[PDB]
Design a protein around this ligand. Structure first.
Ligand SMILES: *CC(=O)NC1CC2(CCN(C(=O)C3(Nc4ccc(Cl)cc4)CCOCC3)CC2)C1
Ligand SMILES: *CC(=O)NC1CC2(CCN(C(=O)C3(Nc4ccc(Cl)cc4)CCOCC3)CC2)C1
Ligand SMILES: [Mg+2]
Ligand SMILES: [Mg+2]
Ligand SMILES: [Mg+2]
Ligand SMILES: [Mg+2]
Lengths: 5, 236, 236, 5
């Protein structure tokens, strides 16, 4: 999965 | 609410304790209590609120993905019929997840967003609104899917417009927003080109502004920039 | 109970799904439901029950230890007075922990133990009884501390007597029991010599019986033996 | 902390 903050 | 009788400062103090103990459900309940006192949140308090719910829903999403994968496999050719249990349990986890998103969205609507006048607060709350509609969209399959996706897009877009007018390109909130909206485009809106363009332009405009920063601000900004780069590397 | 309307097999199926999703609270609630159907548990079902509650209370214990440490520091000379919040939150986590122990002990008393006639089931349930009294003892500070400690010791001792008569020295249940009772001695009963003697003798008697085992039984037994060795290395 | 199972 892609990085989110 | 069960937190109605506790002091605001006591709720914030316990949220911090719950964070240290990695008790994120507790943290979230404390921060919900604090929001419901009706006063605006400081920068630190906004971060506690986001950390708490990010962790709770993050766990739920991971669980949902495990269960959904199992359920998909069950619906493959050759798979032996095991009854309604996998669907029922995926639905249970989904409903809980939706419940938490609805809670967070509830707090933002009543009345965090309408009272947020500074760029750093308003952009932050609108980014959260985008995020929790994005999580709802991840599990959405019915008549409202399109409207959920658009509710995410609309919140992210308003946050984006403010961030571009009112914040420097290296602002960690602006960066975080761009990172997540870019993921929205890739994973939810079926717009990988938009996702890539956004991540790239955000990265480059930040790079060109790093010279204005102190050592500590540089560290903060570059951390999030590396996450944009990580996503670009994944997608290209 | 909220699980009263669900099929026994459905509860077991969902417990396994909850395990895969690392949803241990759910797992535990499913297994409690299954126990409350009133039928005896198979070997697999006993393990699901123990895994679930071990994980739930394990999390609680870690959180309790964080909070207790913070609370101790607050009561040190020079520490600024921060109010009742740290004690209140430690107490909250403690009460929840005690609640879960009481639930598990409830299940064993009504009526898992009294129906357990084979060594592998009875030793297992008595070991669990020892364990959940040991967790209660970890947080106990009042008039009942001694009786809680003795309730742990009594359960562990009965399990030990059965295990020595009815199981080979390499039996993983016998090994697991000895491992935990040895920790009981070290950490709860202030008997480090007994803890060490137990771990050592258990290890040595197992070593001498490994020759009787298959490759797979050897793997299982030696795994737990290494945990005895790890504890001995910690203590000597 | 010591190992238990
Ligand atoms: C007033 C203010 O800016 N407060 C907060 C925002 C903050 C920026 C730095 N942060 C981060 O780098 C991580 N979290 C995060 C969360 C939300 C947004 Cl919009 C941006 C960044 C934490 C560490 O891992 C990288 C992201 C922490 C929050 C300071
Ligand atoms: C019928 C039967 O024996 N069922 C279960 C007991 C079992 C032995 C092997 N196990 C283990 O080695 C671990 N868990 C454990 C839990 C409780 C006891 Cl009393 C002993 C052992 C899991 C892996 O890590 C080491 C301990 C699993 C349970 C098979
Ligand atoms: Mg649904
Ligand atoms: Mg553009
Ligand atoms: Mg107490
Ligand atoms: Mg002896």
């Amino acid at each position: 999965f892609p990085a989110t903050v | 609410g069960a937190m109605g009788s506790m002091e605001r400062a006591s709720l914030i103090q316990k949220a911090k304790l719950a964070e240290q103990a990695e008790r994120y459900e507790d943290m979230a309940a404390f921060m919900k209590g604090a929001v419901e006192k009706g006063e605006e949140l400081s920068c630190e308090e906004r971060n506690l609120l986001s950390v708490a719910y990010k962790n709770v829903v993050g766990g739920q999403r991971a669980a949902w993905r495990v269960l959904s994968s199992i359920e998909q496999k069950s619906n493959e050719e050759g798979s032996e019929e095991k009854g309604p249990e996998v669907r029922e349990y995926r639905e249970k986890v989904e409903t809980e997840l939706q419940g938490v998103c609805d809670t967070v969205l509830g707090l933002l609507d009543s009345h965090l967003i309408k009272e947020a006048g500074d760029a750093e607060s308003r952009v932050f709350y609108l980014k959260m609104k985008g995020d929790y509609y994005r999580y709802l969209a991840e599990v959405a399959t019915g008549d409202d899917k399109k409207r959920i996706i658009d509710s995410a897009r609309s919140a992210y877009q308003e946050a984006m417009d403010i961030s571009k007018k009112e914040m420097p390109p290296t602002n960690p909130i602006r960066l975080g927003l761009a990172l997540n909206f870019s993921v929205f485009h890739y994973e939810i809106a079926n717009s990988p080109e938009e996702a890539i363009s956004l991540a790239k332009t955000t990265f480059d405009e930040a790079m060109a502004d790093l010279h204005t920063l102190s050592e500590d601000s540089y560290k903060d900004s570059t951390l999030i920039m590396q996450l944009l780069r990580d996503n670009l590397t994944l997608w290209t």
